Curated annotation (Swiss-Prot), chain B:
GO MF, one example: monooxygenase activity
Its job: Involved in the degradation and assimilation of (-)-camphor, which allows P.putida strain NCIMB 10007 to grow on this enantiomer of camphor as the sole carbon source. Catalyzes the FMNH(2)-dependent lactonization of 3,6-diketocamphane via a Baeyer-Villiger oxidation to produce the unstable lactone 5-oxo-1,2-campholide with (S,S) configuration, that presumably undergoes spontaneous hydrolysis to form 2-oxo-Delta(3)-4,5,5-trimethylcyclopentenylacetate. Is also able to convert (-)-camphor to the corresponding lactone in vitro.
Enzyme class: oxidoreductase
Signals that turn on the gene: By (-)-camphor and, to a lesser extent, by (+)-camphor.
Pfam family, one: Bac_luciferase
Binding site for FMN: 10, 44, 76, 187-195
Family: Belongs to the bacterial luciferase oxidoreductase family.
Name this protein carries in UniProt: 3,6-diketocamphane 1,6-monooxygenase
Amino acid sequence: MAMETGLIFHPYMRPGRSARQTFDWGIKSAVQADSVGIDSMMISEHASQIWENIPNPELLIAAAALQTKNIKFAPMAHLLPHQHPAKLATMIGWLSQILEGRYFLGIGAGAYPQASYMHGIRNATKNLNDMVRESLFIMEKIWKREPFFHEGKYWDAGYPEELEDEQHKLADFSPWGGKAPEIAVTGFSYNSPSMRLAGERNFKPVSIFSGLDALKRHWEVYSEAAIEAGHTPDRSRHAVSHTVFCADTDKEAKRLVMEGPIGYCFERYLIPIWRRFGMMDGYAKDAGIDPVDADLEFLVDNVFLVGSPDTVTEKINALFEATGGWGTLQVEAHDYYDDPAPWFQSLELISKEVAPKILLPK
Amino acid sequence: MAMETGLIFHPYMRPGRSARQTFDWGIKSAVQADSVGIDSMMISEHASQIWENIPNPELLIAAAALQTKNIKFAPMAHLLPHQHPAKLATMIGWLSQILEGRYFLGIGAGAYPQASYMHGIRNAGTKNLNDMVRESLFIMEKIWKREPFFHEGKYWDAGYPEELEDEQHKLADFSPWGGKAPEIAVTGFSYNSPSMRLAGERNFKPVSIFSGLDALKRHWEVYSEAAIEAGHTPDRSRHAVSHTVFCADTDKEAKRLVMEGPIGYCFERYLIPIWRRFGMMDGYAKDAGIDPVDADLEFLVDNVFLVGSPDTVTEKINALFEATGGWGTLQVEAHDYYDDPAPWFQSLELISKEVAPKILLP
Ligand SMILES: Cc1cc2nc3c(=O)[nH]c(=O)nc-3n(C[C@H](O)[C@H](O)[C@H](O)COP(=O)(O)O)c2cc1C
Ligand SMILES: Cc1cc2nc3c(=O)[nH]c(=O)nc-3n(C[C@H](O)[C@H](O)[C@H](O)COP(=O)(O)O)c2cc1C
């Protein structure tokens, strides 16, 4: 029935944050989210960025695994071109086992050429999408634990035969229940190749909210690819990422956003980038304004899901009418490490008072 | 000063233990060792083994990081041929940062062909594992330095990018704590150890598995000669030596707890048949004047293992020190006491607080 609440931890940590502080904020976020019934926590991967400063989401997932009871974790995404697929497959399976299946897997190519370069991919010639395909092909076969060898374009890998007593046969690091984890992919462009791939393979679709047109287009491409490949598209699997903040009143919610960590990140970091690459055009069209006038207050008033629980509940209901809805509201985590209380109260309000009222039509 | 106490967590988990139980035991082990002043915890890496069932020691280190105050962690060892070196270098630096330098790095080739095969290396003991170790380390040290390069190697492509042409837009810094390579360790097992020679040449930390008096002395001979020849001053206090060690109130109950507990079980079921098949108890047999064919559990408990009361163990260590010159860290092998850890925890407290402080290094 009800739309779930999720957390996406990019993260967006203020420049100057230490690794220990970031890791601490991640574990506290996992524990708090689990405590208020948030369904899932996605954790991103970057080796070359300042704000998005987690190069190994699996370390955080592992650190929070036995400190949580119900929440599911997902790297979003492991960048398949950057790792040996056998090493990655084994880790994925083992971590899935540790979590007793409270796990799913995000895969991706990587959008940052500086980081592609570090991992030996120049002019991001090798093809990152082909690397993704070959890695996944390999990992799926390692999880099956049937012998094979593969001399690939990008990697060599295999699964060995047993040597000629339980203690002497091969380890079993297949994911929980002995099968592949549920796999997810994120889409950003309007006509998303990733959405197409996901429908084709029956993967979990993940969108970053960039306007009504793009959201509709993502589900259009995904469902048609799915039905064509013989799958039944399920809206409840669709996760959509939003900037969301809740407080007792609209006035306090807007103020806390405008004056705190969220407004600070947008003003200092995200807006200049989004403006330079015209990424607020979908927002501008939706609201009828000119992209040149897309500022923090415009976003807070027309884009972000900000207000009292009632105001936020209404805004989500509106989007649902316009789009058809989605399965998980994936709340973007911001740097409240120094001021946890209003952020935790906000998440608690979303998970317990907002999301349960939002019902899926499909 | 005093000889330090260390823990080595291979692990040796009874066949049938789940990934969750293994992970839980590792974290509980790290916390308890920290609480009784154990200096370091080494965690091994295997993808194909049953008893030694941790394919990603860094996950356990990360999970124990914020739960401990003083203990230092090391993967022992990361198998360099199995990972992209840029991905591995980045993880090592970030984890070193999270731990605020309570970290050091074991590297190795890998001694299990079934696991080598998984990672694309056929006919392991064609690609050369030691050459793979060299190229990986060459790359990782340059990534930690954060100076631009690109390397087109025999086994990997990797590099470090130039900054693009505001702090928030500069490259991330995932260099290890203090901006320098971590201290690097290698383990030796064979009599005339190439690993001991390499460690000497490069001023790495030597780690030996105790296999008899002659090998222990040969290890230090090979290491020191390589060290002096390369122009370093060999330091015995950096030498770590792994022993099977159990302490109790009296010699009688210490022996009984070993014979009748997890340690005796692992040795009887798993280790002894292997060691006997590959003549690995010949050094022990030579030492005690018996024939290898007569090496069984009780022989090991009586003449090899460091077992008894605090005084008996202290005297046994002194005899070894007089015979070999000694070592800096007594690396205690962790066994599967997850079901009933009280006598194991007490033993570790006795070793760390009552035994080791009395052993000084000449
Ligand atoms: C604001 C923003 C956030 C993003 N977050 C993620 C993320 O969390 N995980 C991820 O794998 N990719 C992320 N991306 C990159 C896109 O998901 C990537 O381009 C996509 O996988 C490929 O898009 P397409 O196939 O729709 O062209 C993000 C991009 C933007 C602009
Ligand atoms: C009982 C036993 C325990 C071992 N434990 C470890 C270990 O904890 N870490 C490791 O890197 N290698 C371990 N090894 C493998 C040896 O370290 C390996 O032979 C060595 O790295 C290469 O030795 P050499 O260069 O002297 O031939 C172990 C081997 C045996 C037989």
